[PDB]
């Protein structure tokens, strides 16, 4: 069984398919600022 657990720092990237521009990017180091 494969488990994916985002319980430590992670990145997200929103890549637009129409242009391949990056609309948003984030690093989550601590969800509770």
């Amino acid at each position: 069984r494969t488990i994916v657990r985002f319980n430590r720092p992670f990145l997200m990237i929103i890549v637009d398919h129409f242009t391949w521009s990056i609309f948003f990017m984030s690093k989550v180091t601590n969800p509770k600022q």
């Binding site: 985002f6 430590r8 637009d16 242009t19 521009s21 609309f23 948003f24 990017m25 180091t29």
Partner: protein, 330 residues
């Protein structure tokens, strides 16, 4: 152009992390590059070349017309809820070239709002209300302070609200640990999905796992999960080549359980030092050449600011950002 925007996004990201290595990051590369490309409509000589090279365009291969048309088409691509707007707020007595105001409307969709910056609280409220409207209330305080001698402010906003293709059930959200480091955690609402089949790649060389979660319609989010204590090493590998390799390596995999926090984060930035590190220098100096705005070399950038907000929850996500370029007399 794709290459430019990806190269720019990762170059900017790396500078943000260097400046504040212990903070969350949320930003919009496209908001920043659109605001700076808008500014460049009015730039000449070294001021211009530094902006466009700072945005990672290759000026031997790409003309200014190709660059501005790429932002015009991108603006059409943006306008699931997705919107982007541009505006210029201008001292009413400032003389502007017709080419600048016409090109700003045609290419960037920007109106010119006459603004009395000497009544600085009213000017600040107008700009902030413009951004609040564009971001559906999510960014209310883009502008914290506004000098009474401001001549022009260029503003971009972006708003993106989307529903997950496979939404989380709130009944499966439970308080769980999020490890800040090997030894310390915070408790967070941890959402979960079960028995899903999604694009997945375990990158053993880079000590990270990458997955894609889809929204409805035609959007998705790329997730990168470094092994514990490998975030900095993954960050150093961010590049167009790495992103393309990850994309080319994804394969559908059955995932028994996926856990994702429910959370919101926001960040506010002064981008002056960031943009200088990218090579955008003359625009801030007494040698600034923004003579395409007025016809005279009489304007310089004082500050570039950016704010962004990210909300992740069971039904979907919301992302918003805005950028402002403040300009004074020389």
């Amino acid at each position: 152009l794709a290459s430019a925007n990806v190269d720019f996004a990762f170059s900017l990201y790396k500078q943000l992390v260097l400046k504040a290595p212990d903070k969350n990051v949320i930003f919009s590369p496209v908001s920043i590059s659109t605001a700076l490309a808008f500014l460049s409509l009015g730039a000449h000589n070294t001021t211009l070349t530094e902006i466009l090279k700072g945005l990672k365009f290759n000026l031997t291969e790409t003309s200014e017309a190709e660059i501005h048309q790429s932002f015009q088409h991108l603006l059409r691509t943006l306008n699931l809820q997705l919107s982007m707007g541009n505006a210029m707020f201008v001292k009413e007595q400032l003389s502007l070239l017709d080419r600048f105001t016409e090109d700003a409307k045609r290419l960037y969709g920007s109106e010119a709002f006459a603004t009395d910056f000497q009544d600085s609280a009213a000017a600040k409220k107008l700009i902030n209300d413009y951004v609040k409207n564009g971001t559906r209330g999510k960014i209310t305080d883009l502008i914290k302070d506004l000098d009474s001698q401001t001549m022009m402010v260029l503003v971009n906003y972006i708003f993106f609200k989307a529903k997950w293709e496979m939404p989380f059930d709130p009944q499966d959200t439970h308080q769980s640990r999020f490890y800040l480091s090997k030894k310390k955690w915070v408790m967070v609402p941890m959402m979960s999905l079960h028995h899903l089949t999604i694009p997945y790649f375990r990158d053993e060389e880079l000590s990270c796992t990458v997955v894609q979660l889809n929204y409805t319609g035609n959007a998705s989010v790329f997730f990168i999960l470094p092994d514990q204590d490998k975030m900095e090493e993954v960050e150093a590998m961010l590049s167009r080549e790495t992103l393309a390799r990850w994309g080319d390596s994804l394969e559908f995999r059955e995932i028994g359980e996926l856990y994702l926090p429910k959370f919101s984060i926001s960040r506010d930035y002064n981008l002056n030092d960031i943009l200088l590190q990218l090579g955008i220098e003359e625009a801030f100096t007494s040698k600034a050449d923004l003579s395409g705005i007025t016809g005279a070399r009489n304007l310089a950038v004082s500050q570039v600011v950016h704010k962004a907000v990210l909300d992740v929850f069971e039904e979907g996500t919301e992302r918003s950002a805005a950028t402002a370029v403040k300009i004074t007399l020389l």
